[PDB]
Structures are given as C-alpha cells and as structure tokens.
Design a protein around this ligand. Structure first.
Ligand SMILES: NC(=O)c1ccc[n+]([C@@H]2O[C@H](COP(=O)([O-])OP(=O)(O)OC[C@H]3O[C@@H](n4cnc5c(N)ncnc54)[C@H](O)[C@@H]3O)[C@@H](O)[C@H]2O)c1
Ligand SMILES: NC(=O)c1ccc[n+]([C@@H]2O[C@H](COP(=O)([O-])OP(=O)(O)OC[C@H]3O[C@@H](n4cnc5c(N)ncnc54)[C@H](O)[C@@H]3O)[C@@H](O)[C@H]2O)c1
Ligand SMILES: [Zn+2]
Ligand SMILES: [Zn+2]
Ligand SMILES: [Zn+2]
Ligand SMILES: [Zn+2]
Lengths: 346, 338
C-alpha cells in the first residue's frame, strides 16, 4: 500500500505500508479514490495532537468497496461510498441517543492513539469498522469530488447551522472563511438566510466568501462587531457560527450575536477555558453550543443536497495532487497557499 | 397606599396613564431570592417600592382592555410591550420597553408589587385571569419562580425518562424539582448545603446531596451510570455553581442556568468542552411564553407550589420577613396585604 505517514513535527512522507485486512464481520475495505487534507490535519502536523511515527494520516475519503464482512447486507464490492471522519458503534448508549460523535467505542481515522488509534485515509485502502453505521452508498448521479465533503467539513458546517436553529429569514455571522466557514456560507444561503457575514483576515478567502453571497469583513482592518451590528439593525445576527477555534473568536461570537440569539462553536483549540459573560449573559439571553461534529446525524440530508446540485462544495478545491505529492500539499495548505487540497490516489 | 420600600411607609397610589393600563389591588405579594440581591449591596435601588411577585384583583382598566374590576389576576414579574421586534419573536424578556417591577433603575425603574396597588402597563400582555377554581396563593407562583423553573426545564429540553440535576434547593430549585417530576423525569438530584432545604427537596422526590459534606460531581455521576444527568438546572448564581453544572452534566447533555449573579464572567471549558459537546443557556425568564401552560397545570392540581410557603405575614411585618428569608429561617415568605 502506498500511504502518507507522519515522521515528526512538520514532516510527512509517502511510504509503503501493509494493506489492512477484514478483522470483524461488520468491517469493509475501501479502495480510496480521493483523500482530503483537513484543517484538523494541521494540528497533527504541528504536534498539537499526539501521533506515533509511521502512522497513516487522513480522515477525508471517497472510494469503492473492495470487500465486506459476513455481516454486511447493503454494500457489495463495486459500490461507491463515503463515510464520516469519525466512527461509531451503533449500540452504546450514546449511539442509541443518536449522538454518534460521543460513541464509547468512538474514534477518528488517522488521528493517533488518543482517538481510537485508527489507520488513516490518505492511502490506497481503508478499513472501516461497523461499516453498517459508518458508510453511505453514493446516490447514482453524484461525483466523488463533490461527495467527499459530506464525510467531514460540509456536514460539520451544516450540523453547526442546524443545531444553531437557523431558520429562513435569519441573519448569520460566520467567523472563519477557511473551508469549513465556506461550507457554512453556502449552506446558510440555501437554508434561506436573509443576510450572511463572513469575518476573516485573508483577502483571498474573503473574496471567496463574497462570491458565495456573504458580506466580507476583514478583522485586521476594522472592528467586526461594530460592522456586523450596523448590518443587522444594530442588534447583531440571529446566529453566529464560529469556525476558527480559540478564546479570541469565541468572545467575539458572544459579543457579536444579538440578544436572544444563538452561537454555534465548531472550531478546535487547546486552551482549557475562555471567559463566558455572566451578568451581561443573563441580560442578553444566550444559547451556546460547542462540540465535535455529529456527522452521521446529517450525512443523509447532505448527500441528497449534493446529489441534487443545491450545494457545490468542490468549487473550493484549489489543488488536486497525486498521492506522492502529499508533502507539498501539506506545505501549501499549512502556508495558506492552497485553499483545499484533494489527493488523487491511483 | 401602604407599601414596602428600600420598611413600610405611605406612598402615593398610582393612576391609569394609558388605554392598556390596569390597576391591581394586590392581595398577596412575595419576597423572592432576587429581592435578596437588592437587600444586600448587589443591585442598585433608589432609597422606592420593592417586589415583583403578586396576585390580586383588578381595580380599573384603560379604555382599550377581557378584564373587569372583579377579576382575579396574576402577571409576569417582567413587563413587555407586545409589538417590538423581540416581542414579535416571542422573546418577551428582551422587550425593548421591558422592565422588572420594583427592581430599580437598571430594570425599567418600576414601582414594586409589595404594595396595596400595582399599575400594570399593557395589561393585555402582562396579565392573566385566574381560571375559576384556582387559589390566589397557588396562582401567584405562575408570575415568577414556577415559570422561571418551568421555562429553564423546557428550554433545557427535558424529555421523559431524562435524569436531572438541580443546583440550589431554594424556592426556584424546589419548583424545578416538582416540575421535573411531572414532566416524567426518571431521577432528579438536588444539590444544596442546607439540611432543611434538602429535606424539602427529598419530600418532593429528589435525591438530596449536601455539597458541604461530599463531592456532588462524584455522587451525581454514580447516580447516573457514571455519565452524569441529561440536564442540569443551575438555580443559585455565580461561577462556582456554573462550573459545577458544566462538570456534572453528561457529555452531550444540556445546562440551563437560571441563577442571578453580578460577576462579569466565568471560565467555560473549551478543549474539554469540545470533547464533551455541551449546550448551555443563561438568561432571565421568559415568563409570558410559559404562564398559560403553568396556569393550566396549577388549576388542575398537578402542581402545588404553595406547599413551600413557610410564612404568611402581614404587610407591616415585611422587615422581619426579609430577615427571616435572608437568614434562611423562612423558606418562602408571602405578604398578606388588604
Ligand atoms: N467540530 C468538528 O468536529 C470539526 C470538523 C472539522 C474541522 N473542524 C475545525 O474547524 C476549523 C476550520 O477548519 P478549516 O479546514 O476551515 O481550517 P483552516 O485553518 O484552513 O481555516 C481557518 C480560517 O480561519 C482564519 N482565521 C484564523 N485566525 C483568525 C482570527 N483570529 N480572526 C479571523 N479569522 C481567523 C484563517 O485565516 C483561516 O482562513 C478548524 O479549527 C478545524 O480543526 C472542526
Ligand atoms: N433567571 C431568572 O429570571 C430568575 C428568576 C427567579 C430567580 N432567579 C434566581 O434564582 C436564584 C435562586 O432563587 P431562590 O428564590 O431559590 O433564592 P435562594 O437564595 O433561596 O437560593 C439559594 C439557595 O442556594 C443554596 N446555595 C447557595 N450557594 C450554594 C453553593 N455554593 N453550593 C450549594 N448550594 C448553595 C442555598 O442553600 C440556598 O437555599 C437566585 O439567584 C435568584 O436571583 C432567577
Ligand atoms: Zn477533518
Ligand atoms: Zn457507540
Ligand atoms: Zn423573582
Ligand atoms: Zn416588546
């Protein structure tokens, strides 16, 4: 198997490694066709997350089924599939509550031993446990390059917005115009937002945000809070989706949002805490949610939207590279020279 | 014109000033946990008539008002206009013309309810006729502490079979425990530090937990499969109890913070928050949203909040009431006015 592996902080290389085999009756093996590099993968790259050298990286994929365990009914070898970046068992108390992101046997592909110790997706073959839970057949008229987003960054943004109770007419602020933010912007549009505001600090990304229908706001060059408020009757938006990570942007989200509004925090960060407004919080009536995506809950709806053309996430792909050029990909994406990198696996 | 002020003095009775106004002859008036923040040095009050809990009868109504002078009424402790954008979103607690009776100039500068007469603006919005078979002493709770608790729990998405932890077994917490029961909770936990209050919690059906005598987090977790409860209602106020709520609640659960405090902030878990998948809400009650359902529950006997009243005092004995309630000698004090 050709596969991208971690070597040390900020180093990554493509080596020969063993192809995995079926080990459980609900396993499936997937011949990966495309594999993404995610913002989350940068936390690995920068040693923010513990990984052993020689571990296969990546949790974004689309491909075809090679084989299935004796327990799998609805998947055969030909089948084009996509799956959530995180796995779930389907029988623990959290899975029964449909909170698959809190699965007791939960994990994330290619994210090291603190997250299930799973071999990653940037490779020719992927073992998917409990494939009955963790995979979806592609609808017949859907390109793999579109479908791949359903497994991670699109369902993340979608989920953020549904949990944030976005209703038609609502105004929305999105903090972070990276890939996740850009998914959020597009989705917010199709869910009938009356106005969408994108806050970032990189013109290339703000330009992209604007093309998707948002009012761009450079946080380096102005006070985003003052600006967001004037755009929203001096109240603030009904919903804020924060997609950066960290106390700076979270406090921003909480200041920015209107009284009685909702903040949906979706960005990752290491800080153990941040200051949540109390006295002012009581006056303002805030609803706040923070968490990792629960992709399984949303993936079927996201796929139906992709298949029908309502969403076109692949437009944000700046680079399709061969698997062997992965280390360049990581450098590009890290240095913010690529917007989204997709790896073609031969 | 008898009225409690930040002692009980004579003050001028208010008159109708607008065609939606109503004047209410207050018959019972409560002293609330919120009133204790006034009492101590926490909320600014002009050295003014106190209180926001009332039940009484209609004296008079503006030309624009389903209410006549005989009628027994109750109303939210906070007022709302019914036409501003927040009122139209049914977020009456965020009314742009909003305020809280007898709660000083930072909250609408309104004359309080611990007094013989109350002016109620926009009474079309801010009042309800009592259903025919409902005692005033039961009804009064619909205007403030019962609806507050009820609201906290419905917003916290309490579903039948859920387990619930309530932090604070004061009057609000006790409302929450009784409500949680009637909404089909499988198990309710009450955390406080005062035996009298924990005994009361226990009689209502909760497992009492003394936070002075044991780690409430450990204990709550063992009572809830080592997960934590589905929902936590925090009913005390302040960073200590909020952090407690957030530690205690299970992953993927919900915290509904309803306790008042003046600190500008508290530390919300971030890295651990992401792992946990928390939903958090903090706010002042939106009574108008819930009052109609609460009244139906009261009228039909499903809730009996008046059982927590330890003292019915005459208006004039109010200062002893405040002392008793502050010192934690009374559980709930209701003032009888005429
Ligand atoms: N919650 C989940 O389960 C889940 C799933 C996938 C990704 N994520 C997270 O969501 C975030 C988005 O992923 P991505 O691929 O878009 O990452 P990215 O790093 O490629 O995008 C981040 C964007 O935020 C911008 N930004 C950074 N600091 C900023 C600041 N102070 N003010 C304004 N803008 C700022 C950057 O310029 C960049 O455009 C990451 O934190 C990622 O780990 C979470
Ligand atoms: N959100 C709203 O709109 C709203 C409405 C009504 C009341 N409130 C607030 O709810 C809170 C409770 O109201 P109440 O009338 O029940 O008042 P209360 O003063 O009787 O409640 C305090 C109770 O909490 C317990 N307690 C205090 N600190 C504690 C700690 N560190 N650990 C454990 N237990 C502790 C005490 O034993 C006491 O019984 C008050 O802060 C009040 O302002 C808010
Ligand atoms: Zn990812
Ligand atoms: Zn599970
Ligand atoms: Zn009160
Ligand atoms: Zn209003």
């Amino acid at each position: 198997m050709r596969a991208v592996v971690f070597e040390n902080k900020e180093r990554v290389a493509v080596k020969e490694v063993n192809a995995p085999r079926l080990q459980h009756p609900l396993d499936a093996l997937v011949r990966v066709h495309l594999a993404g590099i995610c913002g989350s993968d940068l936390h690995l790259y920068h040693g923010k997350i513990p990984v052993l050298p020689g571990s296969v990286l990546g949790h974004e994929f689309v491909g075809q089924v090679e084989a299935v365990g004796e327990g799998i009914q609805d998947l055969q070898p030909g089948d084009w599939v996509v799956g959530p970046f995180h796995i779930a068992c389907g029988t623990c108390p959290y899975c029964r509550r449909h909170q698959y992101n809190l699965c007791e046997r939960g994990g994330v592909y290619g994210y090291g031993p603190m997250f299930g110790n799973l071999q990653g997706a940037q490779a020719e073959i992927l073992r998917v446990p409990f494939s009955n839970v963790n995979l979806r057949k592609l609808p017949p008229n859907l390109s793999p390059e579109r479908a791949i987003f359903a497994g991670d960054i699109l369902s993340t943004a979608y989920g953020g917005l549904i949990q944030g109770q976005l209703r038609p007419g609502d105004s929305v602020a999105v903090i972070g115009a990276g890939p996740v933010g850009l998914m959020a912007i597009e989705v917010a549009q199709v869910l009938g937002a009356s106005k969408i505001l994108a806050i970032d600090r990189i013109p290339e990304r703000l330009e992209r945000a604007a093309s998707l229908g948002a009012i761009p706001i450079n946080a380096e060059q102005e006070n985003p809070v003052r600006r967001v408020r004037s755009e929203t009757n001096d109240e603030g938006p009904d919903l804020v989706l924060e997609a950066v990570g960290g106390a700076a942007t979270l406090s921003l989200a909480l200041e920015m949002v209107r009284p009685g509004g909702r903040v949906s925090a979706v960005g990752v960060d290491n800080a153990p805490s941040f200051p949540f407004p109390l006295a002012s919080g009581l006056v303002k009536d805030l609803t706040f949610r923070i968490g990792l995506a629960n992709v399984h809950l949303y993936i079927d709806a996201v796929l139906a939207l992709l298949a029908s053309g309502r969403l076109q996430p692949e437009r944000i792909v700046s680079h399709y590279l061969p698997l062997e050029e992965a280390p360049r990909g990581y450098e590009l994406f890290d240095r913010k020279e690529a917007l989204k990198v997709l790896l073609v696996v031969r």
